[PDB]
Design a protein around this nucleic acid. Structure first.
Ligand SMILES: [Ca+2]
Ligand SMILES: [Ca+2]
Lengths: 244, 244
DNA sequence: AAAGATATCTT
DNA sequence: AAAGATATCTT
């Protein structure tokens, strides 16, 4: 399917190619930075061509946002089915060692999930799926990457800012956790778990209806949450009390 | 000086090279996206080797943050002058048509400017200068040719997501404005003016002491600024009255 | 954890 | 503008 073909293409492309720099039209190469900020940009650009290639094989148009603070990264849709749009968003995180627990931020809990047209390319009720493409890289220990430039014959001398990178495709609701991923920017937190848990889809929500309801009523601070719910157990108890 | 040599080298490099993609160690090239999240990253990486080359000719050490979430991008200093450190930060913004008015976010007003060791590589009082390397680009809409991968022999055929990149080097206090650059992430706002105003330093503050005092006492919300000051005129009146 | 830093944009 | 979106990290 579109999903199985996209997952296989992403696994493959990642296995084959290691991004190592930015290149000018003149052929001069500038090495990469160490932060997640440079690597989440690089992972998004890396996935673009793949997503477009797989979508075209399946008859889906691909549209990126026109505005800069909108979701999702990629909107897939057949022109004959306007309300079967698929949302694909790329998220990234790091580990210091290969097998520790990781976690992502999964977008806002106060924007398009509470308002049908807030910060989103198409009305939220036109989407039938919300997929996360998750990248995880292991930081290199060196905090002094290269400060020189390179030519096309020195490609294999360029220090890579990661040791290993893994990628998965999973539904957003399935890997969603019950604790905020950020405070002032109010992001859904994902589960806090090993990499295999995201691939396998071992979450905490019983359904996408429960995931949406949880995040739609989650309070912005601890103070407010202490009178309602802080976690999935307290949310289920809030449901028993009659949403009060 | 360090400064004059730095801006000549930045301006020259901008003029002679055009970034057009991310390259892998295998040689495959991925085209660029058109938003500031991508261009911000590319301009930082492009400037890194230039900053280090010029810094080294003046006998300055270049140190980058060891942790994410810390200012500044580049800390320059001599072993003989440890309390005369120079902070350099790269800021980027865009324009829809060449030469319209622009504005930048200049860093938090609630971190290192109010707490000497908050979110900064070195205590804030060891720095004697805070420079901004400002990048401005005109946005160019992505087309179909940006959605595939390229080989090195097609470098000059890759479509760029930008045009007319301009760069300046200026003191943070000199280009600082009196209105916040962001709400929930409490950043200082720069003046709102044309590129030449930034080059020439036509800001609203009379001194770096006034800049600092203004942003150290600026309240986070309009509700609170209503009773204090919202702009330079109100701040100067408040000061005239005895800070009340 | 919770809350607020890191940079910039939109309405 | 002011206020809160865009991603993700630290503490
Ligand atoms: Ca996104
Ligand atoms: Ca910075």
């Amino acid at each position: 399917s579109l999903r199985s073909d996209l997952i296989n293409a992403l696994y493959d492309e990642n296995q084959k190619y290691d991004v190592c720099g930015i290149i000018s039209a003149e052929g001069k190469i500038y090495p990469l930075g160490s932060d997640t900020k440079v690597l989440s940009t690089i992972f998004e650009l890396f996935s673009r061509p793949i997503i477009n290639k797989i979508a075209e094989k399946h008859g889906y148009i691909v549209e990126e946002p026109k505005q800069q603070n909108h979701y999702p990264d990629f909107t897939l849709y057949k022109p004959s089915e306007p309300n079967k749009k698929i949302a694909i968003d790329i998220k990234t995180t790091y580990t210091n060692k290969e097998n520790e627990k990781i976690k992502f931020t999964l977008g806002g809990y106060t924007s398009f999930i509470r308002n049908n047209t807030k910060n989103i390319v198409y009305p939220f009720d036109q989407y039938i799926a919300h997929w996360i493409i998750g990248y995880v890289y292991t930081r290199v220990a060196t905090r002094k990457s290269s400060l020189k430039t390179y030519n096309i014959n020195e490609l294999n001398e360029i220090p890579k800012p990661y040791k290993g990178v893994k990628v998965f495709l999973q539904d957003k609701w399935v890997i969603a956790g019950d604790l905020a991923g950020s405070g002032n920017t109010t992001n859904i937190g994902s589960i806090h778990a090993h990499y295999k848990d995201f691939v396998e889809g071992k979450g905490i929500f019983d359904s996408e209806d429960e995931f949406l309801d949880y995040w739609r009523n989650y309070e912005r601070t601890s103070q407010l949450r202490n009178d309602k719910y802080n976690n999935i157990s307290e949310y289920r108890n809030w449901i028993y009390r009659g949403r009060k």
